[PDB]
Design a protein around this ligand. Structure first.
Ligand SMILES: Cc1ccc(-c2csc3ncnc(SCCC(=O)O)c23)cc1
Ligand SMILES: [Cl-]
Ligand SMILES: [Cl-]
Ligand SMILES: [Cl-]
Ligand SMILES: [Cl-]
Ligand SMILES: [Cl-]
Length: 329
């Protein structure tokens, strides 16, 4: 059988909390009034949700409304309980209300809108300093929710919104977030393909907060090397193939033998052998200003097969890659 795993930091955060903090199935959702919110315009869209700009007619303040997909009711309580516990945390959106019955009883999330802040989706047209700066801001949100015993499990550029005029960042879309409990096996169908950690691609269910650190590394790799996505797989098997062609198959097999992970007989044959390609081979004349000795060292300590050897969110904030960035703050 597979060898169990535990988180290095924030292990027993939920154990020390009261049961009501993390037992979202027992939570009773205090639904608000839909009439208090009138939709102004449509901001974005997607299969999982439709986002709207709206105004709260009671206080005449602008808000953001997210009409949720018809998801299982248990996941609705999970996301609402997580957003309520993360309220007030740095660089995390603030849930203002929860309403229903727009078109035949549909849950909708009402988030606060910050005055005079135009939030746009995270892109790849940033300088070397802005990459450092906004990575540190994401690290703030990852460290806060991890310390609150919560995995985000869907860290990707589409879930990070930026305001380049005011240096404001928000980590959004907590529909896949979940509470961490030591010894609990978790669903491996989380995050997008390009940002799934090796623990998901080998179907290792006892993962922890370090899943978000791998996803964060994939972003850093694509930003500094100007290659989105960095690991460009076409299916879940090919994703681990692309990772193996960079990080080598050597540390991957030692990772599989450590936790006693059982792969498919055909999967172990198609991986083969690959040498650890250097981080400097992806450096070209276009992105030679975004790459530094600190960036490569920091990226290396994030992109590790062993989730227990990757950097924690705080360790990353202590890395010399952000040295001048923290002195600016
Ligand atoms: C502060 C804040 C509030 C809501 C969101 C948000 C969550 S999902 C989502 N989907 C599309 N846009 C946004 S922000 C759009 C611009 C604004 O009015 O702030 C969001 C992101 C940040
Ligand atoms: Cl994305
Ligand atoms: Cl959201
Ligand atoms: Cl799960
Ligand atoms: Cl690739
Ligand atoms: Cl962490």
């Amino acid at each position: 059988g597979p060898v169990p795993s535990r988180a290095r930091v924030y292990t027993d955060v939920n154990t020390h909390r009261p049961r009501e903090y993390w037992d979202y199935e027992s939570h009773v959702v205090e639904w608000g009034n839909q009439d208090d919110y009138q939709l102004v315009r449509k901001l974005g869209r997607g299969k999982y949700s439709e986002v709207f700009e709206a105004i709260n007619i009671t206080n005449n303040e602008k808000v953001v409304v997210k009409i949720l997909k018809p998801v299982k009711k248990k996941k609705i309580k999970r996301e609402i309980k997580i957003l309520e516990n993360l309220r007030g945390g740095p660089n995390i959106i603030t849930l203002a209300d929860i309403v229903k019955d727009p078109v035949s009883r549909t849950p909708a999330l009402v988030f606060e809108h910050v005055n005079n802040t135009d939030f746009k989706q995270l892109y790849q047209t940033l300088t070397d300093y802005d990459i450092r700066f906004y990575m540190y801001e994401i690290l703030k949100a990852l460290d806060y929710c991890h310390s609150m015993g919560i995995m985000h499990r869907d860290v990707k550029p589409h879930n990070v919104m930026i305001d380049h005029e005011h240096r404001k960042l928000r980590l959004i879309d907590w529909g896949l977030a979940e509470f961490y409990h030591p010894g609990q096996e978790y669903n491996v169908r989380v995050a997008s393909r390009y940002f799934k950690g090796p623990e998901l691609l080998v179907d290792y269910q006892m993962y922890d907060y370090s899943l978000d650190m791998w996803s964060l590394g994939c972003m850093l790799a694509s930003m500094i090397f100007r290659k989105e996505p960095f690991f460009h797989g076409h299916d879940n098997y090919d994703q681990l193939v692309r990772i193996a062609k960079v990080l080598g198959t050597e540390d991957l097999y030692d990772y599989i033998d450590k936790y006693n992970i059982e792969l498919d007989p055909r999967f172990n044959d198609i991986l083969g052998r690959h040498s650890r390609k250097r981080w400097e081979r992806f450096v070209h004349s276009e992105n030679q200003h975004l790459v530094s000795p600190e960036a490569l060292d920091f990226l290396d300590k994030l992109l590790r097969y062993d989730h227990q050897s990757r950097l924690t969110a705080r360790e990353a904030m202590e890395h010399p890659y952000f040295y001048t960035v923290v002195k600016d703050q």
